[PDB]
Amino acid sequence: AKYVINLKQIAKFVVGLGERVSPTDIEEGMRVGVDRSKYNIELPLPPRIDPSVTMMTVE
Amino acid sequence: QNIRDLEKLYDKTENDIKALQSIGQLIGEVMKELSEEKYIVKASSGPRYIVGVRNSVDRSKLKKGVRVTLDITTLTIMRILPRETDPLVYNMTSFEQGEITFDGIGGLTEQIRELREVIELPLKNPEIFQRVGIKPPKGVLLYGPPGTGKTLLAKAVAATIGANFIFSPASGIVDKYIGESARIIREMFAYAKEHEPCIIFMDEVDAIGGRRFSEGTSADREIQRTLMELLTQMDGFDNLGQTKIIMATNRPDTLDPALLRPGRLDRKVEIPLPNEAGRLEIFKIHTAKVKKTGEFDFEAAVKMSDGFNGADIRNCATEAGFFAIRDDRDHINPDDLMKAVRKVAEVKKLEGTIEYQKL
Amino acid sequence: RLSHENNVMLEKIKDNKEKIKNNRQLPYLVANVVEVMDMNEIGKAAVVKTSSRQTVFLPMVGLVDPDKLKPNDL
Ligand SMILES: Nc1ncnc2c1ncn2[C@@H]1O[C@H](COP(=O)(O)OP(=O)(O)OP(=O)(O)O)[C@@H](O)[C@H]1O
Ligand SMILES: [Mg+2]
């Protein structure tokens, strides 16, 4: 299994896993904590939300 | 053939190994000759460099513009690579083909003559254009109501006549990054100069053709730069050598007057709605492949299809075919064309009353 | 003669494939092939265009069908 990663503006690498995440935990649209050197899929992250949509939540 | 094919597989693996030994090289553009061993080469990355050349490269063929290969480590010129074709230009000229010919176009015979007097005549008879003294025309702005043949004519021109065609969508040029909405046009016009004759054909140009705003937003300001880049490479400080531009739209009113000037856009061939005798040709063309099963006198359909525009007649053919299917009959009947014509004519009221001004 | 040569060359093929494997390791960069030329006319050499904005020329391509590369092919 190979994953295509779209680092915002540095590159468009094609990368494998990093052994810290199950192969079924990554799906298209998810944000990946790609490793800095010898890039790898380490930690999936919550989907990006615009900050301006955050304070509109009464706590 | 065991041993021989195994040796062939060995040659393939050896080629893979040789590729594994090889390395890549950057690509730049030579812009100066400081000395016999010092050149000022640009790079696709963007920075300039002072690069020493090899010993085998012919120094004579090194002027402003020639593409060269740069070794990644020491930045040394290696090869003399020829001119470049941007991939977003090959992806434009490599359209399929188109199977329709000038026979398929019906009713349009005078406007076909007007277009061919600019597309074919200068490219195949540049002597009458000399003693008479006329300056050869450049632009042909096809325009008319939506759905009369403004695009089908371009497909016929691509199939017929010849010359290296370049189909150009309107939005297929605009990119997000700064300037790339104009670099694409620059390469489009540069490719033509190396492939004379060229019949560069934009389409739906009212996307990048709008009357330039005076207080538009940021988006409408970068497009205007593209309109400037397109505008200059037709009458600017250079002569278009052998490039003809065909230009199609549905709303010529929303076109920048600088682009509409006679001299940039020459004879403005207008494709009108089919008129009576023209519509009979459309009916004959579009209802010839269908399994006709009667004395198909389209005179009633010609009378009723008032204001019908081209593709609509094809839609009457399609709806008649559908109606024949509704009764499981395997071929359309002359009284089933009538139902389809009526059904399409009723829907024609949904469309706005098509209005346009002869420029 | 044929038997021993064939048996040895199958193993050497396995060796060549293994040597290929030690360089087909992730991660890769992604580039769009700009245009493929046969420089021998003046052996297929392509001109990739990396996402890092570098238009890197290649003396020759490998591990990929040289005839099955078209412009805008990731
Ligand atoms: N004279 C004609 N004879 C036969 N078919 C025609 C004719 N004119 C147009 N058509 C039909 O028009 C269709 C092709 O699109 P068409 O030429 O109507 O678009 P257009 O008016 O150029 O479009 P746009 O509004 O996007 O600029 C085809 O289905 C073709 O059969
Ligand atoms: Mg059209």
Q: What is the resolution of this structure in A?
A: 3.6
Quickly list H helices, B94-131: 110-119, 121-124, 128-131
Maximum C-alpha span of chain A: 42
Contact yes or no for C29 and A15 at CB 8 A: no
Task: Kindly give the distance from the C-alpha atom of residue B240 to the centroid of ligand 2, in angstroms, as a whole number.
Answer: 26
Name every residue whose Cβ is closer than 8 Å to that of residue C72 and which is 6 or more positions away in sequence: B87, B88, B91, C32, C33
The SS3 of residue B25 is strand
- Give which of B180, B181, B159 is closest to B170, Cα–Cα: B181
Ligand 1 centroid – CA C59 distance (Å): 47
The verdict on the CB of residue B144 being under 6 Å from ligand 1 is no
Element housing B143 (H / E): strand B139-143
Tokens of B184: 């694409």
Name the residue among B244, B249, B131 with its Cα closest to residue B195. Answer: B244
Q: Which residues pair with A36 in a beta bridge?
A: none
**Largest Cα span, chain C:** 54
CA distances from B17 to B25, B51, C12, C27 (A): 18, 31, 13, 20
Quick check: CB of B318 below 6 Å from ligand 1?
Answer: no
Torsion sign across C-alpha atoms B240, B244, B248, B251: positive
Q: Which residues of chain C lie closer than 8 angstroms to B49, CB-CB?
A: none
Closest CA to B104 of B285, B303, B312: B285
Which residue, among B329, B244, B238, has the nearest Cα to B291 in the 3D structure?
B329
- List CB contacts (< 8 A) between B75 and chain C: none
CB pairs A-C closer than 8 Å = 28
Interface test mutation site (partner C, options A12, A13, A42, max chain C beta carbons within 10 A):
A12
Chain C residue with minimum CA distance to A13: C29
Ligand closest to CA B101: 1
B146 is in an annotated binding site: yes
Contact between residue C48 and residue B44 where contact means Cβ atoms under 8 Å apart: no
Question: Which strand (E) or helix (H) includes residue A14?
Answer: strand A14-15
C-alpha B249: how far from chain center: 13
Bridge-based pairing state of the strands B49-51 and B67-71:
unpaired
Q: Locate tokens 């525009």: which residue?
A: B309
- Residue B40 near residue B31, CB atoms below 8 Å: yes
Ligand 1 pocket check for B273: Cβ under 6 Å: no
Instruction: Report the nearest atom of ligand 1 relative to the CA of B286.
Output: 4
Tokens representing B205 are 């140009």
- Measured between CB atoms, does C69 come within 8 Å of chain B? no
Question: How many Cβ atoms are within 10 Å of A7's Cβ, its own excluded?
Answer: 13
CA distance B121 to B138: 12
Instruction: Tell me the residue length of chain C.
Output: 74
Do residues A12 and A5 lie in contact, with contact meaning Cβ atoms separated by under 8 Å?
yes
Long-range pairs for B280-289 at CB < 8 Å and ≥24 separation? Answer: B281/B106, B281/B107, B282/B106, B282/B107, B282/B310, B282/B313, B282/B314, B283/B313, B283/B317, B284/B106, B285/B103, B285/B104, B285/B106, B286/B313, B286/B314, B286/B317, B287/B317, B287/B320, B287/B332, B287/B337
Ligand 1: which residue has its CA nearest to atom 30?
B311
